[PDB]
Structure formats: structure tokens, C-alpha cells
């Protein structure tokens, strides 16, 4: 909608209610998903205003993508499915790809996962959280492997209330992940990457450690 022209422009429907959307940083591109069955992931150019792009048939059962981020790098799209166990998938949308490049499915214990963000300092890092668990991701495309960790916070880390948290984000300049809380607090994590002696073995994919908690209001 344009305030000063006072006119609407429109993107035309979905098989279900629109579930989630993210716009490219350049505001050239807009991506959208819908809930329910038969869901489609549908992406658009702002300034044609009658654009098209689509991912068909992304998930059979999956009840539409309940959170989704697009790379500011603009190469990749990445999505979280609504399903009793949720999916994580990455998508080379610059290509006419119509299938997942890489996939993982996660325990229920993490819960509804419904925030996802891309890292402007990276192309192969994403963060997501539920109300009650937060998750770091990295994708090793040469390995063809997507790895996750979802460690559990408890009172013991600070002997303090921490409770429920809502959104998480990649820091401006440091090897860090931020999480914002209903508690009036911010939580921050650091990432640790395969130490050279590990490289000869499993090279346990980068681990996240909850360095710090502070109360801001």
C-alpha cells in the first residue's frame, strides 16, 4: 500500500492463510509461506509488482512453514515447517530449485521454534528458537550435512530466573548469538569451532556456550 498515492498493490493468494514472510534486505525480493496442507513457498519482486516465483510441493504432510528467513546475501532461503516434529531445510532460490538442498528434523522437546534469522556476517549460519529452546545451525555444503545444537539452559548457570525467551539474532561484530527474554534480560552465546586435533575425527560441529546473562529492564 502506498500512503501518498493512496493505492494498494497485491500479491495473489495462497492455498492457505499466509503463515510467514521475509523481505530481502534490498527490498527487491519478498518471500512468503502459508499454513495448512498443500503449502507453497512463494517469492516475489517488489518492483515488477506482478512478479512470480514458487517452490511447489515443498512438504507433503508439513502444515506450512511456521518461520522462514531469507539471506541478506540473497543466495539462500531457509524455512521451518509446522509439523509434530519440525523440519529445517535450505533452498538455493536463485536457482529454479524445487526440492530441499539439505534437511534435518528435530526432537519435539525444543518446541515450536517460531523465530528464525539469517546471519549478515555469514552464508552458512542460522539461529532459531522456540519459547523454550534456542538452536544454532551451520550447513556444511561440501559435506552435504546440516548440523544443529540445542543445549538446555537452567537456573544453575546464574542461580537466577531466566524463564521464557522470544527472539534470537546474530551479533554485530563478534562470534556471538543474542537471545531476548520476556524476563527483561538478554542472553548471549558464543560459538566454538572444531579444534585442530578434532579435525582428524568427527570434528564435532560448532558448539554454542551460554557465556553471559544480564538484566536490562
Amino acid at each position: 500500500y502506498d500512503v501518498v498515492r493512496n493505492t494498494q498493490y497485491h500479491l495473489q493468494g495462497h492455498p492457505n492463510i499466509i503463515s510467514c514472510l521475509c523481505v530481502s534486505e534490498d527490498r527487491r525480493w519478498i518471500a512468503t509461506a502459508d499454513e495448512g496442507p498443500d503449502c507453497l513457498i512463494i517469492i516475489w519482486d517488489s518492483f515488477t509488482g506482478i512478479p512470480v516465483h514458487t517452490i511447489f510441493d515443498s512438504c507433503p504432510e508439513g502444515n506450512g512453514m511456521r518461520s522462514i528467513a531469507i539471506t541478506r546475501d540473497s543466495k539462500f532461503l531457509a524455512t521451518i515447517s509446522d509439523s509434530a516434529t519440525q523440519k529445517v531445510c535450505i533452498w538455493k532460490w536463485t536457482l529454479a530449485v524445487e526440492t530441499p538442498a539439505c534437511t534435518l528434523e528435530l526432537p519435539k522437546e525444543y518446541g515450536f521454534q517460531d523465530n528464525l534469522v539469517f546471519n549478515p556476517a555469514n552464508n552458512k549460519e542460522l539461529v532459531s528458537n522456540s519459547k523454550t529452546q534456542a538452536i544454532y545451525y551451520c550447513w556444511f555444503e561440501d559435506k552435504g550435512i546440516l548440523a544443529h545444537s540445542a543445549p538446555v539452559l537452567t537456573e544453575k548457570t546464574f542461580n537466577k530466573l531466566v524463564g521464557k525467551f522470544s527472539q534470537s539474532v546474530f551479533h554485530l561484530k563478534l562470534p556471538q548469538v543474542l537471545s531476548a527474554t520476556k524476563e527483561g534480560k538478554l542472553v548471549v552465546w558464543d560459538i566454538h569451532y572444531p579444534s585442530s586435533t578434532s579435525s582428524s575425527a568427527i570434528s564435532a560441529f560448532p558448539f554454542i556456550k551460554p557465556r553471559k546473562l544480564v538484566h536490562l529492564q
Binding site: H53, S74, K75, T94, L95
Partner: protein, 345 residues
């Protein structure tokens, strides 16, 4: 203490910085222009003596980052000095060169080969000032250093021979000028390979001697070799840029950066070489205007990669008009395409 810029008295403060010292207004103004227009304050972080770095790791960190900053500014100052020599601003070159030398003395020490580049710039400025024997001082120092030097690279020695030749070129023996520039050209050829712009700079000075000898065919041959080098390099960039822009398009699209890939001082030297080459190529032999068309193409390409749009357009229009009478359609269509790229970009 002294005026560090000339070892005359510290007659006045550098009110811009306090740390710089001037023999009053003339060197105050010239050093203000020369170093302070380029960086000014950054020398203050160099000049400040450190407080105590309290542990081995603190000492190491503080030294490493200070020294590497010093090195970075040493090289930037040396680039600025080179450009001032190429721009003919020898007055402004003298502060920049003397500073770069003194900082090389501090980090490397006077004995270092790393001073030899600065010493040779101080010769070059002296010859811009006509101070031939002063340039002979710093060449003497460099020559002893390199003759002792355990590791002098082919490029480094090419620098030595090139400036040695230039010094004799201010002297009076063309035989020495050829001999030493030939050595410079050899050492450039083996370091860079035979088609580098720096080798071509050697060939250019040789051509200018052959023109002074009025040995028109050899002079023109050298000018051709240099012109072909400049053409080939700029073609390499211009072609790669257009080819990449053409090659493929996802719906993401892209646009590539129009870029010379040169040092600005190398661009100034390119202009000096190509312009003198064009004028001498005409005055020796107007019978080959196509070589002028080639040089005009070369410069129009350079100007486009700079986005010196005005000369890019002018020199392309000249090349096109000459190519229509003198040359096949391939020349004209290239020059038309280049003009269309300039006018669109």
C-alpha cells in the same frame, strides 16, 4: 631536535599536530600539503611513546600492531611520494619521501634494503630539482646496500638499475642510459615477465633515448612494444569486465565493478608514458597513424576504467574518426562499443 622534514631548525610548531616540526612557513606549508592532506593525524598515533605494556603478550601485541601500522603508513607515504614524482609535484614528494625514509630507518634501520626504494625516490625528487649530485648521494648508499645485499630481488635490482639510468640520463652519456635501462628491462622481464607495464616503462625510457638519438625506427619499435603492453593489460581488464557482465544471469542478476585494477600512481605513470609515446610516435613518423589510433584506444580504455569519462569519450571519438579512414571495421566497431559503454555507464 630539528625540522625533521629538512633538518633545519624547529622554527615553528605544527599547529595541526604538535608532533611535526617545520623550518617556518615554506616547509610548514609544503609538508602540510604533502603528508597532512594525505593522512595528517595518523602520524600522531605513531609518534606517541607507549605506556607500559605490562606482560609479554601485551608487549608483543602492542609492538606487532604498532609496527604493522607503521609499515602500512610507510608504504602509503611511499605510494604518495611516487605519485607526487609522477605528477611532477616534486616539492610535495620531498616531504613524503623523507618521512617514508625516516620511518624505514626507525622500523628497519638505515642498513635495510627497504630504504632503497625511498632512497631512489629521493634521487628522483633531487633530479626533479636538478640536484644531480644529491641524487648521486642516495644512489651511492643504495648501490653499496644492494651490492652487499644478500637477497636483492629481480624487481628490487630493476629499480636500482632504472634509477641509475635516470641519473645518468640527467648526466651526459646516452650509452650509459641505454646500458642501465637495459639492465632494468632485463631484471623487470625476469621478475614480472616480458609484458608487464613496468618493463614497458623501461622500454619507454629506452625509446625516449632512441628518439633523442633520432634513431626513429628503433624508437618507434620500443614505443610499439610499450603501447602493445598497455593495450594488452587494459584489454585484459576491459574484456574480462564485459565478458563477466555478459556471461550469465540468474534472476538475482548482478552488476560488476568497473575498475582499473591499477595503482593511481601507476595510472598517472600510464598517462605520462602513453601521452609522451603518442606525441613522439607522431613526430617521429606520422606515416603510421594507426599506431596513434592504438594509443587512443589504449587511453580511452584506461579512462573508462577510471571513469575519466571526458577523456574516455574524447579519445574514443578521435580513435573512431581516425579508424574510419585508416582502419578496418573491427577497429571502428570496437571504438563504437567502447563509446556506447562509456555513455551508458
Amino acid at each position: 631536535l630539528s625540522c625533521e622534514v629538512c633538518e633545519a631548525p624547529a622554527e615553528r610548531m605544527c599547529t595541526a599536530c604538535t608532533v611535526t616540526y617545520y623550518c617556518g612557513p615554506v616547509h610548514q606549508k609544503a609538508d602540510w600539503d604533502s603528508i597532512h592532506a594525505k593522512i595528517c593525524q595518523l602520524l600522531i598515533p605513531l609518534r606517541t611513546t607507549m605506556p607500559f605494556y605490562n606482560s609479554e603478550e601485551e608487549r608483543q601485541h602492542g609492538l606487532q600492531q604498532l609496527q604493522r601500522r607503521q609499515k602500512h603508513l610507510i608504504e602509503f607515504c611511499y605510494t604518495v611520494a611516487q605519485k607526487y614524482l609522477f605528477e611532477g609535484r616534486h616539492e610535495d614528494a620531498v616531504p613524503a619521501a623523507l618521512h617514508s625514509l625516516r620511518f624505514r630507518m626507525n622500523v628497519h634501520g638505515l642498513s635495510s634494503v627497504e630504504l632503497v626504494p625511498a632512497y631512489l625516490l629521493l634521487a628522483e625528487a633531487s633530479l626533479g630539482l636538478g640536484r644531480i649530485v644529491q641524487a648521486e648521494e642516495y644512489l651511492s648508499q643504495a648501490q653499496w646496500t644492494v651490492l652487499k645485499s644478500t637477497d636483492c630481488s629481480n624487481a628490487t635490482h630493476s629499480l636500482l638499475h632504472r634509477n641509475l639510468g635516470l641519473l645518468y640520463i640527467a648526466k651526459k652519456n646516452l650509452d650509459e642510459a641505454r646500458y642501465h635501462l637495459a639492465n632494468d628491462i632485463y631484471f623487470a622481464s625476469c621478475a614480472y615477465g616480458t609484458e608487464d607495464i613496468r618493463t614497458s616503462g623501461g622500454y619507454f625510457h629506452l625509446a625516449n633515448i632512441f628518439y633523442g638519438l633520432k634513431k626513429m625506427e628503433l624508437a618507434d619499435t620500443l614505443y610499439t612494444k610499450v603501447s602493445e603492453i598497455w593495450y594488452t593489460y587494459l584489454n585484459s581488464h576491459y574484456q574480462a569486465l564485459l565478458e563477466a557482465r555478459s556471461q550469465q544471469t540468474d534472476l538475482l542478476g548482478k552488476q560488476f565493478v568497473n575498475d582499473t585494477g591499477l595503482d593511481e600512481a601507476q595510472e598517472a605513470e600510464a598517462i605520462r608514458i602513453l601521452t609522451s609515446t603518442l606525441i613522439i610516435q607522431e613526430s617521429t613518423s606520422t606515416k603510421a597513424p594507426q599506431k596513434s589510433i592504438l594509443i587512443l584506444k589504449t587511453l580511452s580504455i584506461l579512462y573508462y576504467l577510471m571513469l575519466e569519462c571526458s577523456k574516455a569519450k574524447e579519445y574514443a571519438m578521435k580513435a573512431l574518426s581516425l579508424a574510419e579512414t585508416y582502419v578496418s571495421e573491427e577497429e571502428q566497431r570496437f571504438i563504437q562499443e567502447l563509446l556506447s559503454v562509456i555513455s551508458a555507464e
